[PDB]
Every structure is written in structure tokens, then in C-alpha cells.
Amino acid sequence: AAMIXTXKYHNGXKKYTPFSXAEMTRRXXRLRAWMAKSXIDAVLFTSYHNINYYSGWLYCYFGRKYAXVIXXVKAVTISKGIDGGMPWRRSFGXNIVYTDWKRDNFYSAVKKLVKGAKXIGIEHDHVTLXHRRXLXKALPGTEFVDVGXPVMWXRVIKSSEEXXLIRXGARISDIGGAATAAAISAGVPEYEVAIATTXAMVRXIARXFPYVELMDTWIWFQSGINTDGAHNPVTXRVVXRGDILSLNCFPMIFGYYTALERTLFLXXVXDASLXIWXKNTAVHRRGLXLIKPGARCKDIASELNXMYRXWDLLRYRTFGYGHSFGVLXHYYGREAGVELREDIXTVLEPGMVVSMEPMVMXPEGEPGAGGYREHDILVIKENXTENITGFPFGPEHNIIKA
Amino acid sequence: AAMIXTXKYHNGXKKYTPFSXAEMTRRXXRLRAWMAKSXIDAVLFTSYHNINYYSGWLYCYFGRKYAXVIXXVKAVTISKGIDGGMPWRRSFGXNIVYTDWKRDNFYSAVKKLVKGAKXIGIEHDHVTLXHRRXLXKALPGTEFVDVGXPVMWXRVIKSSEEXXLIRXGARISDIGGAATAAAISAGVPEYEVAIATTXAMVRXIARXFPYVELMDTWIWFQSGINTDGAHNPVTXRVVXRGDILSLNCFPMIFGYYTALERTLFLXXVXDASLXIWXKNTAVHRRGLXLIKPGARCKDIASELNXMYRXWDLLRYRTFGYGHSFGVLXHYYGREAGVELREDIXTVLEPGMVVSMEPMVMXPEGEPGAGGYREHDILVIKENXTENITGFPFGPEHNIIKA
């Protein structure tokens, strides 16, 4: 007991951030605005993605509860004692800490920042059944309302600053892109290429920011059958001549995700594979033209489906054509509202940042067996969209003969 | 629709696994037993850690729903189209795939594998409120019971095979350790050290298995104020002579976590800092002796707390003395039932794998400012506990001069 349960130790000074004070305030005020309309007294964010969007700080889980409370006048994050003052140095607003000594210390903190609320917003899509039960025990008369979906929609529109940062990530995506290409050789293990590439981006990232946290940045370099799944982990498989390859760059900068995904081939490509590769590339080019303000997600997916249908490749499609960007990674975020999927009528609006990544996968034993995929990032504007991915795609440039 | 919604396509052949068929069957039958005694018809696992423990396969989230169903006769994993046949190649048992074409495709998948069930077990500590209502919308008269807690308790005990794998991780933790040490030097940026270390471990893992997926393995190398938080990310800060440093190794092998954490100093260490470091190491040696079968987690903590209370350092403790190992990582898992915290009365039994990692944090400006910590893993046996961490700890060895 004589041990501190909830105290605020602000160690060190606020760290650099790419986002301006106005940008961070804009976000926090967007919420207060939504609260005011839905009669909410305070909002309790708990996911990686929301806390990062609204505070600028990205937390490390390891089984502990984390959060951020926002009412009309304040904005506070709730980190654990294991994080010292890093969460305070990195978040826009205030920070408070709780310890492991008592099992309810976290709730004791949310309670302190929630004094008086009647209706509180929590993320219905991140809060578990257990967490909800413990929250009701901690906040007796509070009615919980969802803020998860509302944030998601508000996040689909990127500001110029977010836009600025994503543009910067795309650049690094190309730097990595160049490093993979240079590493490709018959005989080299996949993991060696990944190491070469990730190192390239980490160093590049470390160099372009006065201050920055090198985190989660990774590479997915797949060869042969490993290419049958877009998220397949790097393995120790040896790359062979002729193998179909998949270059995937994911540099994570201040929580924001950007990627570069390109199909490649070692030494040479066979007719069957070349055949499918070009057809997929053709769909890609068409996809890049369909991204425009006012277009419905499904319409885009329906039109592209046709081209595949002609070459009877439709049944080999692996996943949706594109998703929203911003604050997400492989283990958090992603605005489900914007998905280039057949039954999503969501309209594309200026400010959104979607991707075009057509992929088909052919089975083992089949000619051209493997996964084919190109991935570009487009910023939607008032009367068009800007493709910000520089790396070349297609047979004309990606048959690596090093 | 001329497009497949739920189909199973097993592209490739079952990959190698460190676990035997007996080991995996054991885990799946532990559930089947619990279900039988609690009258459950089927279990729907949905978390990273549970699907990995029971199927051996670690999925990639990226916003999609994943699962594994287990009734009395079958064991099937549910993966997305974007994953191709990788989920099948790594799953112990059957595998089914669903597509993005329709929003409920995943649900008709679980629906198919759950026919006739009245009581279904889900993970209440992982299922969101949103996920929960959708499951109720898809499985009408079905009653949901928690299976997360039951699994957590069953996983606290590690089999020999798991113990084997964990010993291999620890060995790799030591290689990372040597690599970090070799890279420490006034003038070098933190991330350069991190890269050297991670590269060393990834290469060492790729070399130890006929087949292995190189995933998530990472290093946290902290210097100066960045040592105030144990999970503080790598930054681009240049290391200076006399800086306190934290070496942290986390190799991820087939989803299993192991760790090596050691306090280090560059060139020299001041008297103030050497002072705190020696006492922390003292709390460490004592902690290693207190880990034995029969001990209650809370008793170990109360006993070590008294040591810190002697030197008036108790107020600087950052977090719990130790946790349980197994299928965990920074973004998933962790058996909450075994925490070396003040209010946890769990009795350590043979077969558990716990850590001993005392830490103290001194604020900026104070003498000795910084975060001090050591981390050893111990495999509890019938009559004692084996320390499998080999890298040295203490001032006698970690005042890096190079």
C-alpha cells in the first residue's frame, strides 16, 4: 500500500513531433465536437490506433491496459509504470501513470479522469468482454457509447500534415525497394534480402527526422510458394533462378504506415508466369485510373472484376483491391469503412488515402504458380488522385539480373 | 455471385514444426477434456496466442477476423484469402478459407464449423463488444461461455518440447547479447546497435531450423533517458561515454518468446550509478534463489520489496518482478495468472517458466538517473529451478570499454 498506485511522473521533456500543435488540436477538437453532438461527457480510447491518432504516442502492450481520456477541457494518456516518462515525453496533452502492485490501479486512473461523467465513449471494436465488465465495475452509473466507428470515419480524411508524412514514408518505401532489388540473387536466403532491405529503411528513417523512433519497420520478401499469401513471413528458403518473388516494404514512421509492394522475378520469367504478370499489371493500370472523388468502393471492384473475368482469372483473386491508410500496421488500426470490396458502397472523398493492389494467386503444380501483386498509394484530391509510389512495376523493369 | 465466399484451398504441403504430433494432439485434447466437463459443444479461438498454441500457426491480423474451431472430433483454423495456403501449411489439423467479397463471409465459415452447437466457448479477453454481437447475429440460439481463462491456466505449464524450444530461444538471446556488446561504443547511434543485434539473432535462428519463419524478433537498445521505460523504442540518439545502457533481446521462434535484459555502461560508470546498479543486482541474485516450486508469486515480491525498502529504493520500482513465458510477445498473449505481483497468490508449480527481472528507475537530474534492470528466465522443476540465461550480469562484466 505504501507503494504509489497512481502518480504522474513526467520524466524529461516533450519530444519532437512531425505534427504541429494545430494538427494535434484539430484532432482532439474533432472528438469534443462529436461528443457535444451525441451528449458524451468523456471519451476513453484504448486501442493502439486511436491513442496514437489523438495523442501522437504509440504504446507497447505486453498484456497491460492503456488509455487516453478526453473531455471538453482536458486530454490525458494513461501509461504504466514500466514505461516511465516515455509516454509523457511523446504525447500531446497530459499523461498519468499506474502501477502493477494492485490489480485495479488502471481503473483507479480512469476513474480519476472521469469524475462526473454519465455517458462515456469507448471503442466497442477494441474493448473486450472482460475489459467491459471491469469497466462497469469501475464506473457504476456510466452508460457506454461507441466512439470507435465515429473516429474511424473521421480518420479516413487525412490532413495536409498527415498527407505530408505519408508522402515521406512512400519515399522511404522506394529506398527499401531499391535495396531489395540490389540484394536479389539465385542462392541467397529470403531472410538475407529482408535484412538488407529493413536496414536500408531504418537508417534512412533515422536520418530524416531530428528525433524519431525506429519501430516495427519490416520487410516481407517472399520467393516461390511463399508468395501465395501477401502477409507470409520471411523464411529461410533459398531463392532459385526463375523464382517468382514479392518485394514488400513497410516503413513505420510515428505510427503511420506506408508500403511498396512489387512483383519481381529472379534471372528470368517463364511464358506462363509472364502471361499472368502482365494481365495483373493491366488491371493495376486500370485500377489507378478508377480512383477518384465520388467513386463508390464497390463500383471500382466491380469494374476491375470484369477484366479478370475476361481472362478467366477472377477465381484466383486473393483479396480486396485496396484499403484506407493513416494510422495502422499489421497489429492495429485500419478504417474498415474504406475497403475496395464488392459490397462496400462507401464513396471516395477528397483527403482519403487509399491503395490499389490487385492480386491473384495460382496454385502449386499449375503453370505460373505463385502470387502476383503490385501495390500503389494514391492521395484523393478535389478533382482527381495522385499516385505517390515511385518504384517501377512490371516486366519492363522487374526481372532482376544481378 | 460467380465468386467463392468460403472455400478451402490447401496450397502446398504441411511445413516442419518444432513440435511433435503427440505434443499438438495433447494441447487439442486438453480443450476437448475441459469442454466435456463443462458441457461445451465447440470452441472458437480467435486470439494470436490461442490459435498459435493450439494450431502452431501465428496469423497476421491487418484488420481481419481469424479463428480456430475445436469440437470433440475436429480441429480447424479459419484464415483469409489473402493468406493463400500458408495458414494450411502451418496448421496442425484442418484449415478453411473465407474471402473479402462479402462482409459476413467469415461468419458463414464459423457457422459451417459450428453446426448444432448450443454452448460455445470464446475468449472473453479478446473478443470485442462489436465482434460479440456479430457472433450472436450469426449463431442465433447459441450460448457463449469463456474459454480464455481456462486456456490460460492450462498453458501455464510447459511441456518438455516447449521447454526445449525455450532453451533454444535463450541460447539465441545470448548471441544477441554478445553482438550488442560488441557494437557498444561512444559515438554510435542506438539504432545502429539495434540493427547489429537483431541481424545477429535473425541469422542465428534461420540457421537452427530446417524450416523457420523469421518474424517479430527485435532488440531494444536504450541509452540515457531512454532507459526510463523497459519497452521504450529504439531512437536515433547518439550514445555518449558514461551513458547508462539497456540491452534487450527478444528472439521470436515459432511464436515463442524468450528474453535477455541486461544493464550496461559505456566506458565508465559514476559512483552514484554504480551504487544503484549493485543493489539492483543484489535484488536479482536473491530473486533467482526465491524462485522455487511451492512459492506464491506475491510472497516472492513482498520478500524482495523488503530489500528495496532497506535501501529506500522501493519508491523507484517500475514494474512487476516477473511473468510467465510461453506463447506471448509485445502484441499478443501472456498468462495473467502468473505474475510476480503483490496481490497474486498463484503457487508456482513444476513446469512453469517464469522470469526474474527487477527494475528501478531514477528520474532525470537525480544522481544515478536512469533505468536499471536485469532479466533471467527460469524453468521450474519438481525440486528447484534452472536458470537458462547465460549472459553475465553486473559491473564485473558489463562496463563496456571498446
Side-chain angles (χ1 to χ4, degrees), chain A residues 120-143:
Chain A
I120 302 171
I122 60 175
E123 288 164 86
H124 280 219
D125 79 329
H126 169 272
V127 173
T128 68
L129 299 185
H131 195 184
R132 201 281 203 293
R133 184 172 69 269
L135 281 179
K137 196 205 201 69
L139 307 180
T142 295
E143 180 194 316

Side-chain angles (χ1 to χ4, degrees), chain B residues 47-71:
Chain B
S47 66
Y48 289 109
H49 53 89
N50 280 190
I51 291 174
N52 188 71
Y53 185 71
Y54 296 116
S55 84
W57 162 68
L58 179 56
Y59 71 83
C60 177
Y61 174 55
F62 253 123
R64 300 188 179 71
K65 298 286 160 42
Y66 288 87
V69 174
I70 296 180

Side-chain angles (χ1 to χ4, degrees), chain B residues 159-241:
Chain B
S159 67
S160 293
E161 287 187 50
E162 285 175 296
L165 192 56
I166 299 171
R167 281 174 186 283
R171 188 182 77 61
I172 302 178
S173 284
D174 289 340
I175 297 166
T180 298
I184 310 313
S185 173
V188 66
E190 302 186 337
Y191 63 91
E192 279 300 326
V193 172
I195 291 178
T197 313
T198 297
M201 292 178 314
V202 177
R203 291 194 229 270
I205 293 165
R207 207 173 61 70
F209 298 97
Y211 169 79
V212 65
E213 304 190 315
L214 293 311
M215 286 178 76
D216 313 318
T217 297
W218 88 94
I219 299 296
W220 273 327
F221 179 66
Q222 296 144 5
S223 76
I225 196 172
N226 288 328
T227 62
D228 77 331
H231 301 164
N232 286 10
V234 171
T235 65
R237 186 181 114 96
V238 175
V239 185
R241 297 191 178 65

